[PDB]
Amino acid sequence: MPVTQEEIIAGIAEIIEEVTGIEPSEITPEKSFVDDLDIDSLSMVEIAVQTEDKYGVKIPDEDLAGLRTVGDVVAYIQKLEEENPEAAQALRAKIESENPDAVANVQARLEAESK
């Protein structure tokens, strides 16, 4: 009934495909708002303008500033209400020590394109 995961994952993802024009299934709770989206706070600002409307969730700038990932963009919602008084849907290694990824290897093996 309330705003669930698939809600902020499917509901938003869909919206994201409107502002950023990104794929729905592409959007995941592992996003970083930018690190992933790479659209910046420009489009993201819209996705919210919608999500915060379509449903009416509370995610003002005062919070949009903290929101780092979907899990955070979600918690801020549910948390506000009362669903999972733990951390959010992703956390898996101490609260404070949040990490919506679950790394398990090394990096520094990526490249780039550049104009």
- What CATH number is given to the structural domain containing 88? 1.10.1200.10
Q: Which residues of 64-88 are buried (b: 16+ CB within 10 A; e: fewer)?
A: beebebbbbbbbbbbeeeebeeebb
Other C-beta atoms within 10 Å of 107: how many? 6
Torsion of CA 58, 63, 67, 71, to 10 degrees: -40
Contact present, 102 and 92 (Cβ < 8 Å): yes
Domain that holds residue 2: 1-115
The CA dihedral of 89, 93, 97, 101, to the nearest 10 degrees, is -60
Catalytic site positions: 40
Question: What's the longest Cα–Cα distance across the chain?
Answer: 47
**Residue found under tokens 């550049």:** 114
Give the C-alpha separation, 80 to 7, whole Å: 16
What is the number of structural domains in the chain?
1
DSSP per-residue string spanning 37-56: T-SHHHHHHHHHHHHHHHT-
